[PDB]
Amino acid sequence: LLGEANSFLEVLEQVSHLAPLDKPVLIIGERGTGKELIASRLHYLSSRWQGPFISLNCAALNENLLDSELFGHERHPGRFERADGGTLFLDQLATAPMMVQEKLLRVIEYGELERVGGSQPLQVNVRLVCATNADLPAMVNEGTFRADLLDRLAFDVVQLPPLRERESDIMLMAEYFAIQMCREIKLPLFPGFTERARETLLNYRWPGNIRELKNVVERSVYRHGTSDYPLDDIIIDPFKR
Numbered sequence: 404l405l406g407e408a409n410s411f412l413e414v415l416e417q418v419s420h421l422a423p424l425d426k427p428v429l430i431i432g433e434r435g436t437g438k439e440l441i442a443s444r445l446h447y448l449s450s451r452w453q454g455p456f457i458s459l460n461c462a463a464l465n466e467n468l469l470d471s472e473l474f475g476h477e478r479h480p481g482r483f484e485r486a487d488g489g490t491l492f493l494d495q496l497a498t499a500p501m502m503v504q505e506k507l508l509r510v511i512e513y514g515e516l517e518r519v520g521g522s523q524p525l526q527v528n529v530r531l532v533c534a535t536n537a538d539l540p541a542m543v544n545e546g547t548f549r550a551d552l553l554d555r556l557a558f559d560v561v562q563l564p565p566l567r568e569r570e571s572d573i574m575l576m577a578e579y580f581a582i583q584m585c586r587e588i589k590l591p592l593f594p595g596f597t598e599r600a601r602e603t604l605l606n607y608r609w610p611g612n613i614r615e616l617k618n619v620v621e622r623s624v625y626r627h628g629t630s631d632y633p634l635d636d637i638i639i640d641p642f643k644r
């Protein structure tokens with residue numbers, strides 16, 4: 404929940420207003436910016452908070468396995484079924500094959516799963532949250548994302564700022580992560596960051612955002628290993644000698 408940058412606080416405000424709706428929300432942001440945490444917040448601030456919160460990463464599964472995991476087969480209940488009365492979070496949405504996109508639109512618009520065999524369709528009641536860092540309108544133009552799915556899925560859009568655009572939050576979060584690492588390795592006090600360390604942290608572009616910042620800071624505190632003088636060496640790249 405860390406951050407004071409205006410851009411982040413505006414996201415939290417937006418989320419508070421979107422959460423009670425049953426409308427789909429699209430979250431745009433880089434890796435490590437907190438997208439799944441925001442999806443979770445949408446669920447727990449909604450009327451569905453006692454229902455299930457289910458997640459699925461679309462990039463992780465090949466096309467036939469993604470189809471079965473999302474819509475079910477035979478049985479093997481899919482993630483829409485498991486999310487009935489709750490919220491389903493679809494991460495890396497732009498990697499979904501076009502077959503899955505069309506089937507997703509069908510579920511959104513008709514509210515049921517189709518299914519094979521003698522079974523009747525399964526009606527489902529699921530609040531959808533999706534995330535990506537792709538330019539979805541650009542993909543629509545290329546024919547790699549369905550325009551009709553976007554016209555429907557993007558009821559509203561939450562844009563999470565990358566850490567490099569929340570420059571004020573870098574030192575706040577670095578200090579928080581450093582202190583927790585000091586507890587983990589039993590140092591009595593975090594001895595601070597030198598100006599060199601601060602320059603290194605603030606100049607780096609953080610392609611992995613908060614996840615990367617946490618790891619870099621934890622590693623740096625461990626390598627420093629003392630409370631006797633301030634931390635000077637920020638180890639961004641551990642693959643260097």
Ligand SMILES: Nc1ncnc2c1ncn2[C@@H]1O[C@H](COP(=O)(O)OP(=O)(O)O)[C@@H](O)[C@H]1O
Binds near residue numbers: 434439440
């Ligand atoms: N506002 C925040 N304050 C503190 N930690 C955060 C914040 N946002 C994200 N994190 C942390 O950064 C890491 C990445 O968060 P996550 O929600 O998985 O990002 P994404 O889903 O975009 O990859 C997690 O360890 C999470 O706890």
